[PDB]
Amino acid sequence: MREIVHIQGGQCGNQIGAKFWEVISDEHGIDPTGTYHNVYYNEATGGRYVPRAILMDLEPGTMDSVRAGPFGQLFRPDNFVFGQTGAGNNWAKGHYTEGAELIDSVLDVVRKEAEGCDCLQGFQITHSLGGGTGSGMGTLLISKVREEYPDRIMETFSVVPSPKVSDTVVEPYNATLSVHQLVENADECMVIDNEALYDICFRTLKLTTPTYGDLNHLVSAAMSGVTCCLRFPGQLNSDLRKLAVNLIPFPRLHFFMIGFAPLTSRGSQQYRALTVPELTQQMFDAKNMMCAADPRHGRYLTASALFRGRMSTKEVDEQMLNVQNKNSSYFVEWIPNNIKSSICDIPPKGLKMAVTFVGNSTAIQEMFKRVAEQFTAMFRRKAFLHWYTGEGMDEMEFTEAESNMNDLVSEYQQYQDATA
């Protein structure tokens, strides 16, 4: 009855998954041993609960990572598949030679996991787009599972490479090669980039030393809020599919933007009484979203907002109307009433009000534009290309991937500029 498996991949995807599982355990009142104090968890002998997630990676370091952190004993060893080498920041080493011999096995651990459910609402993936392991394996797996279960939807909670603050030197190749395939067999590519996460955690919470734990926790909160209106009753309920129907007008404009609310520090926490219009002003601000792309620089094709807690639905709908009507320029004309709302009934742990905003908006083609810029700059000289062409990859697939990327961005531009 509308269950969700949680496939992971790569080190970043694995850390995000561990954080998300422990946050969900916090919301659903579970302890790090799996005892109470069906959509996500599964029942197990002795009243125990085990998450319905698989954990794949080539390097066994992330194994000890998800063991060390709390709530690591919730998972089951049958879902700990792990290689030995680690693609070491090489895309093809997780898509053709070394990654392949794992995906097969992973298929097994999916096929004796999906059929475990009875009415599966779809999958969801958590991985990176630059790291070879995560990107490559997740792309191959998206391929296989879309070949297997085409009827269900597969959200991809992807973290695109940090555009300007790069930590590796082979991001563009991996990102382009992966997006070329993700645009085909994916349905909800919600992009995240550490630039925006540091921006938020600096200029909205004044925190001292932001480690990856805090960014993972924030993305966890957003991930939970995305489907909590499904997990719980509400005055106006939604799901993983109503979002898709109300968010994409064409089978390939499905790349989203994520935003969470509210977020303040103790100083600002003392002030600013909590009320729905303040939440709207916080969610529809530019820099308050998980993507380093000022949304004013594009138009919102469409945008949904899920509220959590108790409120007055008239206030919600009236604020939505006021905000889509006053700033008519930043919104798109040829589609009317392009905003969407939904309301749950159980807010998070001690948070009287919570908003999760998901928006399909043509203001995110700039990210792909600049990533493809870096790519085509590093490809005209065939730089760092032997590492790939030595592993069966040719040099035509790169041109195909870049041309598909440019076709996607051209689609965004073309059907943004359209009129009625």
């Binding site: 919470l205 925190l207 001292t208 805090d214």
Partner: peptide, 4 residues
């Protein structure tokens, strides 16, 4: 919260 557990900010710090």
């Amino acid at each position: 919260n557990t900010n710090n």
